[PDB]
Design a protein around this ligand. Structure first.
Ligand code: NA
Ligand code: NA
Length: 95
RNA sequence: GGCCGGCAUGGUCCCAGCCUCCUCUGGCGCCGGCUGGGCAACACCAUUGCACUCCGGUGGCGAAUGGGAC
């Protein structure tokens, strides 16, 4: 149900009908206040659909990005967000 | 999107209209067969999925007009 506080927040239960680049921008449009986002990862695959990965620089940013945006409607769909199971490749490059 | 066959139709331009997965001298008379490339768009079904490798599948072409200048 919940993982240990990661740099990336695993957001799922998103709108499938929305295109990749459009959704990748609209998420940034409402998430660019908690902290500096490195890159959002959006896929259109079979199982990889419906979810996204918002990589945050500061951990405290992703901490407040999860608790505030939880259940917030997005394209007529409530956002089900979690912490990432493992650190992202960009974060792995840091330390 | 490409081929074939049966039939029907005097023929060349002009205005506007109309069609579609497959360029907006593209195509737009009926009936019947053969067959391809791609899911990019649109639709629908499946999927509640932890990724850093791009990657589910299917339908649609079984489509579309009159009038005029000679
Ligand atoms: Na041929
Ligand atoms: Na698809």
């Amino acid at each position: 149900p919940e993982t240990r506080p990661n740099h990336t927040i695993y957001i799922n239960n998103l709108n499938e009908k929305i295109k990749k680049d459009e959704l990748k921008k609209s998420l940034h449009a409402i998430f660019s206040r908690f902290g500096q986002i490195l890159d959002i990862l959006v896929s259109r695959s079979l199982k990889m659909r419906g979810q996204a990965f918002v990589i945050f620089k500061e951990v405290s940013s992703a901490t407040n990005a999860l608790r505030s945006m939880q259940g917030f409607p997005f394209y007529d769909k409530p956002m089900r967000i979690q912490y990432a199971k493992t650190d992202s490749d960009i974060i792995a490059k840091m330390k």
